[PDB]
Amino acid sequence: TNEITIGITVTTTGPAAALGIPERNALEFVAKEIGGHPLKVIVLDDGGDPTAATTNARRFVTESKADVIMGSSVTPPTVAVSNVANEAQVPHIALAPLPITPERAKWSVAMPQPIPIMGKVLYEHMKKNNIKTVGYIGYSDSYGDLWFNDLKKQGEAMGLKIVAEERFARPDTSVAGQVLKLVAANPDAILVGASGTAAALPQTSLRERGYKGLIYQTHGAASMDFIRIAGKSAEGVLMASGPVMDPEGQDDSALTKKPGLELNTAYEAKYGPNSRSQFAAHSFDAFKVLERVVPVALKTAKPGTQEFREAIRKALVSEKDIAASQGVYSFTETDRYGLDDRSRILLTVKDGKYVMVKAAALEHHHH
Ligand SMILES: COc1cc(/C=C/C(=O)O)ccc1O
């Protein structure tokens, strides 16, 4: 019963607050002790800023002597947190997608779906609905590149033609010049590689300028905020999402159904109708991971030692089929996401509501 120390850096101020506030809110609904030991959870805002997240992670690993760290809410500070964790040798659970490199693989795993699983479900839909040419607009940063690179690699391997690439910066409040080019090229479909508030900006700008192709969005867009902001321009979007957005529609055999119901009932009872989100689920699921790996680490090591950090690291890879709201996690030395087809669905928006268009893979089918 000495504590297990968890440092979390998430984005609860600035425009990425749309992603970090739900992550931080969902901590009300996670375990407060594991295996006899209380969880000391220290939460700090980073504003989405890579330097502030580096500062928080640094102080967690050296001053707080954290056993685990988590964060951040968007890809650039998440990269920064991974770099701290892999230097300091501390288990890191990422709460936003990030490029895994050998520099980051040893000490980091990631809760959000990896870009290629999400891209696959979008591009298969494009192929099935008569799309040949695709344009892109996304952030001029590492998340923007993940998505563009996946669109080029997977999409071209499926016979899609990528006819236009545009970028914008996160704080931009206008994409007039990029929308101008995209409308000119008039692709059959446009993939928007963005998140939260910023994801609704190319959505509205494109419709206001009379684009009439299909618009596709990533799982960075999967909260009610996108509908609140995009209004009617949201209609008929196609959006990749984790299954936590619709546990009701899952088969009772889905290992993700129960925990998704658990999170959403609590979250929405507090925060209101349709307040569920892709993002709240990541911190909830991170604590489901901890519930599996910590009792295993506790057999051979005490909280607050390097040996405990090492034991968690190993357990992340020895413990298979970890059921959570967003998927069933089996991490490996080389797969730091640990996810398969059970971790994604496709949503549309119809009359201001998300509707599931394509279900996650069934438990008793191939993955
Ligand atoms: C918080 O959860 C998520 C965040 C993002 C945001 C990416 C970015 O803007 O860098 C994408 C997918 C997620 O599941």
Residue numbers in the entry: 28 to 394
What does the paper say about this structure?
Data from a combination of fluorescence spectroscopy and ITC clearly show that both proteins have binding affinities in the nanomolar range for coumarate, caffeate and ferulate, with weaker (but still high affinity) binding of cinnamate. In view of the tight binding of coumarate to RPA1789 evidenced by both ITC and fluorescence spectroscopy, the genome context of the rpa1789 and rpa1791-1793 transporter genes, their clustering with coumarate catabolic genes and their common regulation by CouR, we propose that the components of this ABC transporter be designated CouP (RPA1789), CouS (RPA1791), CouT (RPA1792) and CouU (RPA1793). The structure displays all the features expected of an ABC-bacterial periplasmic binding protein; namely a two-domain structure in which an intrinsic cleft positioned between the two domains forms the ligand-binding pocket.
After a denaturation and refolding protocol that removed this endogenous ligand contaminant, a 2.5 Å structure with coumarate bound and a 1.9 Å structure with ferulate bound were determined. A summary of the relevant data processing and refinement statistics for the ferulate complex and the ligand free form are presented in Table 3, and the 1.9 Å structure of CouP with ferulate bound is shown in Figure 5. H-bond interactions are also made between the carboxyl group on the ferulate side chain and Arg197, Ser222 and Thr102. These latter interactions explain why compounds such as 4-hydroxybenzoate showed no evidence of binding; they lack the 3-carbon chain that ensures optimal bond distances on each side of the binding cleft are formed. The methoxy-group possessed by ferulate sits in a pocket bounded by the side chains of Leu46, Phe306 and His309 and the main chain carbonyl oxygen atoms of Ser100 and Leu122. There are also close ligand contacts with Glu50, Phe306 and His309. The data also explain how structurally similar ligand contaminants like 4-HPP can be incorporated into the binding pocket.
